[PDB]
């Protein structure tokens, strides 16, 4: 019977004609304004004001209540609280000693439900508690700055949907208009309501506690091979710049997160295996010792039914039934017939801009599925042909058609893109155009349907077409039909190609996705030299480091045997981050420049160290016998991943003054491992293959010759070269 008291207090409050007029004039909207109304100017130096105010007699303010009165005025000659009432709380003020007293000799309150209320946190603890810590590793880590989930959620919803659910749980009456959402989380509402039922904790806290575990806290962080929230929460302990730490959390891990990471493992294995002779050998070697968090890759691939080409290649390589089962977020397919050729092309879209997308060629048939709705799809290069489906759930049917329409990449689908569609992120990062077009047309469907076109429904046995509203209609979507009606032993080549028992190939390592991405769970390689699956900068550094380490031998062996020490397992890994279409050309160049130093007396250890790694890929010379000439050697990754031939570069530069080599930021001393003649010995010689310095810049020869103009010279022809700003040199063939 709290109702009476409130009404009785309203009568008291309404006797203050000032309060009366406030209540009568201030609108329910304006409550928000007058709630925040106060005298208190915002405390700008709280760190200070606290440190100061703690030295005062009575810094704290009690809330006027029978509990406040249970605190005594003084205890054993300690003034706990005063008579003077605070301006804010309109209750007695007290010293910090009051708290310490209450926590010691205060009344013992009922802490029932606490654990259920603050479960969110207790789980956060439970994950650390039931975790397993592996080994710390010291070595380069390329941290990528990406937007990640900070705290694991009970169930993810938009803030609006989330808030509406919390209202249904805590404040039923003041909910407003019932939304679809209400029914969608009916289980969670009842479940939470039944758990928070018996609690004395203030509803406003229970609100924010639910908000904490329904609203997504998603922010940018520097991450490395760990996106999963239950990893992100621990990110501080997971890695630094120059060290890594293996950490297995507790509780549970999602089959989807297990899958999406499992792909990256396979892709990373294949990407590296491609460079070695007998890729299958290395592919198998690594895969057997590849651990996804705590779960072996082989076990994971066996357990999970799904994944991409790479997963199937590695499955075959290990000896597991390859599942040509496929996903496109919500849509999930399985190939019956066809062969897909992914060509990157410049697609114009309805709003009127040009987006680069990987378009698939050939006529293919897939077993499309979406929830309880199933279907058979048929598509050709940027055109859906025929879509058979079942009449399951109305929205599940509605989604499958939109997913299949987008998946087909029909030029009609691209025409129906009206409004703002972001392919580029706020931080200038690439988002997957197909996975964003999928995500866009699931929100705005009526545009796609109208921008597609209709036709007469089929007049067959159990075939009866459906219109926009997903009802058995006369007009159906152009090439859509609704029906009442719902492996083979492979082998894998050493070069990684899945051949049928007949001969025709179904997949190859040339068909896997080139896009590296942050694995959801922690990927570990239980073989020594795990760095080989690392990033461009990691491989680059770990390689040059291993070159420096064994420079003593490697340099000597070079002065005895010519090509004996070009073939090294480190330089193999290093090749897998070289563009394959320049790999051979770079080796062709480098080996010539190296041999040019050895034979013509003109050495340069900093250059030797720089180029030696490139000399692994079988050489690729020009048709006229001479090698290709280069200024910079571009590597896989960002436009900063390149090695300059003449100068230094963001990956590699040498400081002669200090005799200090700088690799991806890390500084190494070449003191002791340097010849006496080198200092005065110019670089001009070890810059172009079959080219050596004659004198200094000759104005008669004119301007500085380009790579092309240099390559197109007859032996014993002079030329002007620039090594770096303010070092002109006169070089001859």
């Amino acid at each position: 019977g709290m109702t009476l008291a409130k009404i009785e207090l309203l009568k008291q409050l309404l006797r203050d004609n000032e309060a009366k007029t406030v209540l009568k004039q201030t609108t329910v909207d304006q409550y928000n304004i007058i709630r925040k109304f106060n005298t208190s100017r915002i405390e700008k130096n709280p760190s200070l004001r606290m440190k100061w105010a703690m030295c005062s007699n009575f810094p704290l303010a009690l809330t006027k209540g029978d509990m406040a009165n249970r605190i005594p005025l003084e205890y054993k000659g300690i003034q706990l609280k005063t008579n003077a009432e605070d301006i804010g709380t309109k209750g007695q003020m007290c010293s910090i000693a009051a708290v310490t007293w209450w926590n010691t000799y205060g009344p013992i309150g009922d802490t029932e439900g606490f654990e259920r209320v603050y479960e969110s946190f207790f789980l956060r603890k439970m994950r650390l508690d039931n975790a397993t810590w592996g080994r710390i590793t010291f070595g380069p880590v390329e941290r990528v700055r990406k937007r990640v989930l900070l705290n694991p959620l009970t169930k993810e919803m938009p803030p609006d949907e989330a808030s509406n659910v919390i209202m249904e749980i805590l404040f039923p009456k003041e909910a407003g208009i019932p939304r679809e959402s209400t029914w969608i989380h009916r289980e969670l509402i009842k479940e939470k309501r039944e758990k928070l039922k018996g609690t004395m904790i203030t509803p406003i806290v229970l609100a924010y506690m639910l908000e904490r575990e329904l609203v997504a806290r998603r922010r940018f962080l520097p991450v490395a091979g760990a996106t999963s929230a239950e990893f992100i929460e621990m990110l501080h302990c997971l890695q630094g710049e120059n060290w890594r730490q293996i950490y297995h959390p507790g509780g549970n891990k999602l089959t989807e997160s297990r899958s999406q990471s499992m792909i990256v493992a396979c892709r990373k294995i294949i990407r590296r295996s491609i460079v070695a002779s007998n890729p299958l050998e290395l592919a198998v070697e690594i895969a057997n010792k590849t651990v996804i968090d705590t779960e072996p890759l082989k076990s994971c691939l066996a357990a999970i039914d799904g994944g991409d080409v790479a997963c199937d290649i590695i499955r075959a390589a290990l000896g597991l039934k390859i599942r040509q089962r496929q996903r496109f977020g919500r849509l999930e397919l399985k190939r019956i017939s066809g062969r897909g050729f992914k060509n990157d092309e410049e697609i114009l879209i309805g709003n009127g801009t040009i987006q680069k997308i990987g378009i698939w060629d050939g006529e293919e048939e897939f077993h499309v599925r979406c929830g309880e709705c199933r279907g058979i799809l048929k598509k050709s290069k940027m055109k859906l042909e025929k879509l058979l489906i079942n009449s399951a759930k109305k929205e599940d049917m509605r989604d499958l058609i939109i997913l299949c329409m987008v998946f087909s990449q029909d030029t009609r689908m691209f025409q129906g893109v009206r409004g703002e569609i972001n392919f580029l992120n706020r931080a200038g990062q690439l988002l997957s155009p197909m996975y964003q077009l999928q995500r866009y047309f699931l929100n705005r469907s009526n545009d796609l349907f109208d921008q597609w076109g209709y036709e007469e429904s089929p007049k067959a046995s159990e075939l009866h077409g459906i219109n926009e509203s997903m009802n058995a209609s006369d007009y159906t979507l152009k090439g859509v039909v609704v029906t009442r009606n719902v492996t083979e032993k492979v082998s894998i080549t050493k070069n990684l190609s899945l051949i049928k028992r007949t001969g025709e190939v179904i997949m190859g390592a040339n068909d896997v996705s080139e896009l590296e991405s942050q694995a959801q769970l922690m990927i570990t390689y239980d073989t020594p030299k795990m760095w080989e699956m690392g990033t461009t900068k990691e491989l680059v550094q770990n390689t040059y480091q291993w070159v420096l380490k064994n420079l003593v031998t490697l340099k000597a062996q070079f002065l005895l045997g010519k090509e004996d020490m070009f073939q090294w397992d480190a330089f193999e890994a290093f090749e897998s981050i070289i563009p394959q279409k320049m790999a051979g050309q770079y080796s062709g160049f480098a080996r010539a420049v190296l041999k040019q130093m050895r034979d013509q007396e003109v050495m340069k250890t900093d250059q030797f160290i720089k180029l030696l790694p490139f000399c692994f890929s079988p050489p690729k010379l020009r048709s006229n016998g001479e090698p290709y000439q280069f200024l910079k050697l571009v590597l896989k990754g960002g436009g900063e991943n390149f090695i300059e031939v003449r100068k230094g570069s963001p990956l590699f530069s040498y400081n002669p003054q200090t005799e200090v080599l700088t690799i991806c930021g890390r500084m190494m001393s070449l003191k002791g491992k340097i010849e006496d003649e080198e200092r005065n010995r110019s670089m001009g010689n070890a810059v172009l293959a079959g080219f050596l310095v004659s004198g200094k810049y000759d104005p008669d020869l004119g301007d500085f010759k380009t790579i092309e103009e240099l390559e197109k010279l007859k032996p014993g022809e002079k030329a002007n070269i620039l090594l770096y700003q303010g070092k002109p040199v006169k070089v001859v063939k």
């Binding site: 440190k51 592996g134 120059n242 060290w243 070092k727």
Partner: protein, 486 residues
């Protein structure tokens, strides 16, 4: 329109660019070298390298600040009993009699058997704390009528020359002691190898600083500025004798209380954060003020007996100064512990960097050196115009000290100089990197740096050190002049 406007705009409008050459980088703040300017004086709140703590070995468990200050003097009674003022140096505008009387009031009051450390508001203590020295507020009506009432000329920091004692402070504060001060509390037991690496790595970093002079000084500065702030709020309208106390542990693991001197706190009705509370410092010191006379114009010194420093009878002086602080400086004093972090981090960065190269924990390697790697060294300083190399620990300590001095001499002058000079430090690093740097108005860039250099000792010395280092770099550059030159 842009073409049309640029076409008709005066050629006199341009960035007037020039390629930076080493010779263009002249020394900054040339006035610091002018001997005709006064020697920058010691203007810190407390003594640092010139300090002297009286050693009072405690039971190990603490007591009241009056009690320890009493028992500390009770041991060194020869000093405490010295009632005859043997004055050595006087501050131009100070009172020998009043100051000595005040010292004696402190000693007596802190020595007595009473509970209180309150001081009777005597004519001397009133002069010392600056009683009722604030001007009286009057109406603008009356103000305007009065012609003799005027807006005062802003008082400016006067120019000063380089002072050795600044260099000497760095040198001594940087060096190793037998005494650990830091009060670093407990931590959670280690589980993750990261924590085991961190803890083991701490043992090297923390100790290397804890066993250095700067640390003790920092801790003293903190623990004083705490009790001072606590008194300032609690005992607002009371003159109080706060003892300059600090706990120290020797190699053998014995807890010694260190009384460095007695301070008195004037009325502290501190409304604003900037609002000043006059604090009068009486500090023990072995340092003879006659030696570096231009260091102690702000101080008044009394010879108060002697002590055995080892085999030597060093004469004990008493440095008496009318000083002041405010809520902010007092708070920032308590937040001076974080000097450890700024220095520790910067070197842990190098440890972790070098660890990535060698592929193991290079902590133990960088300091001492292992079977594989010899120890890490750094270009540390000069010795009759010749560069000298120092230990990783030394290099660490030198920074930790620098970070303390960043607080102790922290003001508007430093903030400016530090920020503006950073701009030139980079222009140097470009010349070092050989990234042919360009400048548009170098003079204007210099003036912004040079206007900050006034009467801040750390600024004035940082200019000297900068100018010295710049010279040593400028030399190193020569090696690169002739490279790939045929």
């Amino acid at each position: 329109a842009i073409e049309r406007n640029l076409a008709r705009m005066s050629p006199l409008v341009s960035v007037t660019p020039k390629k930076l050459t080493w010779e263009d980088l002249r020394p900054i703040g040339p006035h610091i070298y002018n001997h005709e300017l006064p020697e920058v004086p010691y203007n810190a709140f407390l003594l640092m390298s010139d300090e002297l703590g009286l050693a009072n070995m405690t039971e190990g468990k603490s007591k009241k600040p009056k009690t320890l200050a009493k028992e500390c003097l009770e041991k060194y009674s020869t000093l405490r009993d010295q009632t005859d003022p043997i004055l050595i140096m006087k501050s131009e505008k100070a009172n020998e009699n009043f100051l000595w009387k005040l010292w004696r009031d402190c000693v007596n009051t802190i020595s007595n058997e009473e509970m209180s450390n309150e001081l009777q508001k005597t004519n001397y203590a009133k002069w010392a704390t600056g009683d009722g020295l604030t001007y009286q507020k009057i109406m603008k009506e009356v103000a305007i009528d009065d012609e003799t009432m005027c807006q005062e000329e802003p008082k400016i920091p006067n120019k000063c020359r380089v002072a050795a004692w600044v260099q000497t402070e760095m040198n001594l504060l940087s060096t190793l002691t037998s005494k650990r001060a830091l009060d670093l509390p407990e931590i959670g037991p280690d589980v993750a190898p990261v924590e085991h690496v961190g803890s083991e790595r701490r043992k090297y970093f923390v100790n290397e600083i804890n066993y250095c002079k700067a640390s003790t000084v920092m801790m003293k500065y903190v623990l004083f500025h705490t009790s001072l702030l606590n008194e300032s709020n609690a005992s607002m309208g009371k003159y109080k004798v706060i003892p300059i106390t600090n706990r120290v542990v020797n190699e053998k693991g014995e807890s010694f209380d260190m009384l460095y001197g007695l301070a008195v706190k004037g009325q502290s009705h501190l409304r604003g954060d900037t609002d000043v509370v006059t604090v009068v410092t009486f500090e023990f010191s072995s340092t003879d003020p006659r030696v570096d006379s231009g260091k102690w114009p702000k101080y008044t010194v009394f010879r108060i007996g002697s002590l055995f420093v080892s085999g030597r009878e060093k004469s004990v002086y008493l440095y008496c100064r009318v000083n002041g602080t405010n809520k902010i400086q007092m708070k920032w004093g308590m937040e001076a512990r974080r000097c450890l972090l700024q220095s520790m981090q910067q070197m842990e960065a190098i440890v972790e960097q070098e660890s990535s190269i060698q592929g193991y924990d290079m902590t133990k390697a960088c300091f001492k050196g292992d079977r594989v790697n010899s120890p890490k060294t750094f270009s540390i300083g000069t010795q009759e115009g010749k560069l000298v190399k120092g230990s990783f620990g030394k290099a660490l300590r030198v920074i930790f000290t620098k970070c303390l001095m960043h607080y102790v001499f922290g003001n508007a002058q430093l903030e400016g100089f530090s920020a503006e000079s950073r701009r030139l430090l980079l222009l140097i690093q470009a010349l070092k990197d050989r990234k042919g740097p360009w400048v548009f108005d170098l003079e204007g860039m210099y003036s912004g740096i040079e206007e900050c250099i006034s009467n801040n000792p750390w600024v004035i010395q940082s200019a000297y050190w900068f100018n010295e280092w710049l010279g040593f770099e400028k030399e190193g550059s020569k090696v690169l002049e002739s490279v790939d030159e045929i």
